[PDB]
Each structure stands twice: as C-alpha cells, then as structure tokens.
Amino acid sequence: PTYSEMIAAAIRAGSSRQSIQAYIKSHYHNKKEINRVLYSLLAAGVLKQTGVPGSWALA
Amino acid sequence: PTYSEMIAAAIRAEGGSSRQSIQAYIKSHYKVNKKEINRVLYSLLAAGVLKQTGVPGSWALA
DNA sequence: CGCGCG
DNA sequence: CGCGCG
C-alpha cells in the first residue's frame, strides 16, 4: 500500500532504517528515498527519532 | 586547469576563503556544482593540501 | 556514515 | 543546511 503504512507495519513488527528497508523489500526504494519518507513523517508528527544509526518508532 | 589549480588560485586571490567564495571565483574566471567542489576540497583536505579554519567552514592552503 | 539537503 | 557519502 502507501509507504507510510508499509513503514508502520515494519515498526510494529525502535526499528532502524536498515530494518525498515529490509522489511519492505522482503514483504512487498534506495536508502535516500526511504530516508526522505522517514523524515517527512517525522516532520509531520507520525514518527519519532531515538541517533547513530537512526532509530525510528511510531509516535 | 585542474580543480586543485583553480581552487588554489581562488584561495590566493582572497583579501580565509569559503566554499561559495571559491565557487563564485571559479564560475566567473573559468565558468566551471556544490557537490563537485566539496568533493575536491575535502579530498585536498585529506591529502594535506588544504586546511579548515566552522559553518560552513573556511578553506586555506597548507 | 548520522545524510533527509531542494 | 554543516553534506564531502561512494
């Protein structure tokens, strides 16, 4: 479905960008593209950051 | 001339040079983006040709 | 190496 | 907004 729901499913299943990226490919693109979506949701209040590497979780 | 030669020439003409300073000098003396300049500046930093002196940081010969 | 950057 | 990154 939409990238936000696929990322939400990855977190439900603190998850990193690499974890989220691997969940989407193995269940359903490049590091830059996924990062843009992750930071767009962070700007909108859907996600929260917890570093190096970037760990993501649902707000 | 090579990027190292253009960058050095930009640094000497400064009256301590910023990336935009080096970029503007090159673009009006030879008319040759941000990633390509920073690639060379930070490479010449690694080889000891240049030194940093902040945000975005100023460049100078070593 | 965190990088998403326009 | 520092970004050079591969």
Numbering used by the authors:
A (entry chain A): 27 to 39, 45 to 59, 63 to 64, 1169 to 1178, 76 to 85, 87 to 88, 1192, 92 to 93, ...
B (entry chain B): 27 to 41, 45 to 61, 64, 1169 to 1178, 76 to 85, 87 to 88, 1192, 92 to 93, ...
Authors' account:
Left-handed Z-DNA is radically different from the most common right-handed B-DNA and can be stabilized by interactions with the Zα domain, which is found in a group of proteins, such as human ADAR1 and viral E3L proteins. In general, Zα domains can both bind to the preformed Z-DNA with a high affinity as a Z-DNA binder and shift the B–Z equilibrium of a potential Z-forming DNA toward Z conformation (referred to as B–Z transition) as a B–Z converter. In this study, we successfully converted the B–Z transition-defective Zα domain, vvZαE3L, into a B–Z converter by improving B-DNA binding ability, suggesting that B-DNA binding is involved in the B–Z transition. In addition, we engineered the canonical B-DNA binding protein GH5 into a Zα-like protein having both Z-DNA binding and B–Z transition activities by introducing Z-DNA interacting residues.
We chose GH5, the globular domain of the linker histone H5, as a target B-DNA binder to engineer into a Z-DNA binding protein because a structural analysis of GH5 showed that it has a high structural homology with hZαADAR1. Similarly, we mutated five residues of GH5 (K41G, S42G, R43G, K53A and R95A) to improve the solubility of the GH5/DNA complex (referred to as GH5* hereinafter). To obtain detailed structural information of the interaction between engineered GH5* chimera and Z-DNA, we determined the crystal structure of one of the B-to-Z converting mutants, GH5*:α3NADAR1-PW, in complex with [d(TCGCGCG)]2 at a resolution of 2.75 Å. Two protein molecules and one duplex DNA molecule, [d(TCGCGCG)]2, are present in an asymmetric unit of the crystal lattice. In this complex, DNA was shown to form typical Z-conformation with alternating anti- and syn-conformations of nucleotides and was structurally well aligned to the hZαADAR1-bound Z-DNA, demonstrating that this GH5* chimera successfully achieved Z-conformation-specific DNA binding in the same manner as hZαADAR1. The well-conserved interactions are mediated by N1173, R1174, and Y1177 of the α3 helix of this chimera, which are derived from hZαADAR1. Whereas the overall structural alignment between GH5*:α3NADAR1-PW and hZαADAR1 gives an RMSD of 2.1 Å, the RMSD value for the alignment of the Z-DNA binding interface including the α3 helix and the β-wing is only 0.80 Å. In contrast, the overall alignment of GH5*:α3NADAR1-PW with free GH5 gives a smaller RMSD value than the local alignment involving only the α3 helix and the β-wing (1.2 Å versus 3.3 Å). This large structural deviation in local alignment is caused by a 19.5° rotation of an α3 helix toward Z-DNA in the GH5*:α3NADAR1–PW/Z–DNA complex structure. Our complex structure of a GH5* chimera demonstrated successful engineering of GH5, a B-DNA binder, into a Z-DNA binder by introducing a few Z-DNA contacting residues on the α3N and in a β-wing, while maintaining the overall structural integrity of the wHTH motif of GH5.
